[PDB]
């Protein structure tokens, strides 16, 4: 309804953190890939139920709901990971007991590069002092930006309106509000780049048969 009502709806809809145990033995290619893919599969289930709580999303064509989630899921996972990591410099907080840095990254060929992008982008959001209600708006815009087409423009405009409202609550000048909006949205193409590198990496690992049978993750991977 109101921008405030839409932000409170997204706040409530925020998934609970998925719990995964750090392997007992030091990470191998296999235990690292198993930990991340198990996490992704669990988070994807919560992601679907989050999307259904965005006001208007379930009113879109089912084919459009599918296309949006298939297109954006890795970017939505990475935006959430960056938010969970913002209070822990040098760390990627995959889960409360899965706290990784470039050390763990060594265990899987080419994942170090992905971790470096994720840490770098997290630093940019940290330097901008990204706020919880801004994150909520940005994460929904990632999904929605990725007649049903008329409804989707209206849904994206509603979230955009909510983010403009959150920035306004900060009380900075109208010029500074535009610059802050620009700087937040310009960081999303850095999340999108990290997503594309991550997707290519995971597809390559599925080719090697390092990937286990997680039904939903496999379905979402094969959409690329």
């Amino acid at each position: 309804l109101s921008p405030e009502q839409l932000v409170l709806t997204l706040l409530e809809a925020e998934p609970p953190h998925v719990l995964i145990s750090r392997p007992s033995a030091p990470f191998t290619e296999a235990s690292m890939m198993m930990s991340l893919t198990k996490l992704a599969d669990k988070e994807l289930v919560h992601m679907i139920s989050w999307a259904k709580k965005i006001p208007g999303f379930v009113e879109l064509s089912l084919f459009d709901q599918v296309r949006l989630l298939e297109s954006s899921w890795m970017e939505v996972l990475m935006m959430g990971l960056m938010w969970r990591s913002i209070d822990h410099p040098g760390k990627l907080i995959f889960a409360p007991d899965l706290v990784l840095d470039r050390d763990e990254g060594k265990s899987v060929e080419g994942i170090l590069e992905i971790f470096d992008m994720l840490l770098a982008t997290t630093s940019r959001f940290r330097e901008l002092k990204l706020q919880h209600k801004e994150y909520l708006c940005v994460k929904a815009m990632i999904l929605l930006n990725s007649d049903s087409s008329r409804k989707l423009a209206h849904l994206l405009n509603a979230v955009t309106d909510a983010l403009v409202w959150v920035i306004a609550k900060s009380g900075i000048s109208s010029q500074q509000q535009s610059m802050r909006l620009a700087n937040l949205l310009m960081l999303l193409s850095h999340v999108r780049h990290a997503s594309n590198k991550g997707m290519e990496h995971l597809l390559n690992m599925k080719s090697k048969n390092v990937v286990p049978v997680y039904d939903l993750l496999l379905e979402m991977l094969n959409a690329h």
Binding site: I48, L69, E70, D215, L216, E219, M220
Partner: peptide, 10 residues
């Protein structure tokens, strides 16, 4: 298939 189940029958 599982995506469509989670979207509509969950």
């Amino acid at each position: 298939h599982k995506l469509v189940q989670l979207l509509t029958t969950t």
